[PDB]
Scaffold this motif. Sequence first.
Motif, PDB file in Angstrom:
ATOM      1  N   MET A  35      36.432 -50.854  81.770  1.00  0.00           N
ATOM      2  CA  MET A  35      37.082 -49.829  80.997  1.00  0.00           C
ATOM      3  C   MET A  35      36.355 -48.330  80.846  1.00  0.00           C
ATOM      4  N   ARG A  36      35.525 -48.463  81.932  1.00  0.00           N
ATOM      5  CA  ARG A  36      33.992 -47.258  81.940  1.00  0.00           C
ATOM      6  C   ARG A  36      34.981 -46.595  82.587  1.00  0.00           C
ATOM      7  N   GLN A  37      35.676 -46.731  83.871  1.00  0.00           N
ATOM      8  CA  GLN A  37      35.945 -46.303  84.633  1.00  0.00           C
ATOM      9  C   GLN A  37      37.501 -45.456  84.402  1.00  0.00           C
ATOM     10  N   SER A  38      37.580 -46.553  83.492  1.00  0.00           N
ATOM     11  CA  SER A  38      39.247 -45.693  83.078  1.00  0.00           C
ATOM     12  C   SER A  38      38.139 -44.615  82.208  1.00  0.00           C
ATOM     13  N   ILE A  39      38.137 -44.635  80.636  1.00  0.00           N
ATOM     14  CA  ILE A  39      37.201 -43.140  80.269  1.00  0.00           C
ATOM     15  C   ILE A  39      36.721 -42.201  80.931  1.00  0.00           C
ATOM     16  N   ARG A  40      36.410 -42.268  82.718  1.00  0.00           N
ATOM     17  CA  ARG A  40      36.090 -41.398  82.682  1.00  0.00           C
ATOM     18  C   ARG A  40      37.286 -40.599  84.375  1.00  0.00           C
ATOM     19  N   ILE A  41      38.350 -41.187  84.310  1.00  0.00           N
ATOM     20  CA  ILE A  41      39.330 -41.190  84.829  1.00  0.00           C
ATOM     21  C   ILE A  41      40.264 -40.108  83.637  1.00  0.00           C
ATOM     22  N   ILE A  42      40.303 -40.252  82.407  1.00  0.00           N
ATOM     23  CA  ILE A  42      40.900 -39.234  81.504  1.00  0.00           C
ATOM     24  C   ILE A  42      39.725 -38.403  81.278  1.00  0.00           C
ATOM     25  N   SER A  43      38.851 -37.949  81.883  1.00  0.00           N
ATOM     26  CA  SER A  43      38.224 -36.518  81.321  1.00  0.00           C
ATOM     27  C   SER A  43      38.123 -36.797  82.546  1.00  0.00           C
ATOM     28  N   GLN A  44      38.491 -37.046  83.566  1.00  0.00           N
ATOM     29  CA  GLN A  44      38.770 -36.328  84.620  1.00  0.00           C
ATOM     30  C   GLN A  44      40.710 -35.548  84.212  1.00  0.00           C
ATOM     31  N   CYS A  45      41.371 -36.429  84.179  1.00  0.00           N
ATOM     32  CA  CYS A  45      42.442 -36.079  83.588  1.00  0.00           C
ATOM     33  C   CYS A  45      43.023 -34.774  82.754  1.00  0.00           C
ATOM     34  N   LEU A  46      42.158 -35.134  81.274  1.00  0.00           N
ATOM     35  CA  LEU A  46      41.809 -34.332  80.703  1.00  0.00           C
ATOM     36  C   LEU A  46      41.307 -32.383  81.021  1.00  0.00           C
ATOM     37  N   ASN A  47      40.279 -32.360  82.528  1.00  0.00           N
ATOM     38  CA  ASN A  47      40.394 -31.357  82.762  1.00  0.00           C
ATOM     39  C   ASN A  47      41.040 -30.710  83.966  1.00  0.00           C
ATOM     40  N   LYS A  48      41.601 -31.311  84.862  1.00  0.00           N
ATOM     41  CA  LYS A  48      42.361 -30.820  85.703  1.00  0.00           C
ATOM     42  C   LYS A  48      43.933 -31.032  85.737  1.00  0.00           C
ATOM     43  N   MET A  49      44.715 -30.766  84.709  1.00  0.00           N
ATOM     44  CA  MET A  49      46.108 -30.889  84.511  1.00  0.00           C
ATOM     45  C   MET A  49      47.325 -29.331  84.550  1.00  0.00           C
ATOM     46  N   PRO A  50      48.025 -29.346  84.717  1.00  0.00           N
ATOM     47  CA  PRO A  50      48.777 -28.650  85.404  1.00  0.00           C
ATOM     48  C   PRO A  50      49.648 -28.339  84.069  1.00  0.00           C
ATOM     49  N   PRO A  51      50.492 -27.131  83.972  1.00  0.00           N
ATOM     50  CA  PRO A  51      51.370 -26.366  82.999  1.00  0.00           C
ATOM     51  C   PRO A  51      52.921 -26.735  83.861  1.00  0.00           C
ATOM     52  N   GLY A  52      52.840 -27.728  84.705  1.00  0.00           N
ATOM     53  CA  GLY A  52      54.316 -27.670  85.794  1.00  0.00           C
ATOM     54  C   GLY A  52      55.797 -27.697  85.227  1.00  0.00           C
ATOM     55  N   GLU A  53      55.799 -28.880  84.446  1.00  0.00           N
ATOM     56  CA  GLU A  53      57.402 -29.618  83.757  1.00  0.00           C
ATOM     57  C   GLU A  53      57.037 -30.669  83.684  1.00  0.00           C
ATOM     58  N   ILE A  54      58.434 -31.079  82.681  1.00  0.00           N
ATOM     59  CA  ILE A  54      58.468 -32.246  82.261  1.00  0.00           C
ATOM     60  C   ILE A  54      59.042 -33.897  83.244  1.00  0.00           C
TER      61      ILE A  54
END
Lengths: 54, 68
Positions: A35-54
């Motif tokens: 669970m804790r590492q899922s929180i860390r992956i959510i943090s890095q995913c919100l850091n590096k989101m690209p504005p690509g496409e749907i």
Amino acid sequence: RKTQPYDVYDQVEFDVPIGSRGDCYDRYLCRVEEMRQSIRIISQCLNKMPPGEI
Amino acid sequence: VKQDMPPVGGYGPIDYKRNLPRRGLSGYSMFAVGIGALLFGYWSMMRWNRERRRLQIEDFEARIALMP
């Protein structure tokens, strides 16, 4: 997830927990740190989101 | 223009520490507090017991002098 990246998981930094004695309290603590590492992956995913496409 | 939802300016840190402050003190202090309060209660109980012993002897004097 770490062995065969089925998606971009190879570009996020985390560590899957391991058990010690093959045991239910130990497996419980393994679930808690997953669970804790899922929180860390959510943090890095919100850091590096690209504005690509749907 | 584009109106997706990227992270606007980057988001700050998120903690994941096991932060347990370990409230309380050492166990030797706990034994010292327990034995001290216990012995305090023992001394107060001793004093009240012997006061009621004095009054119980006075009630014995009442029943002795009251009897004939």
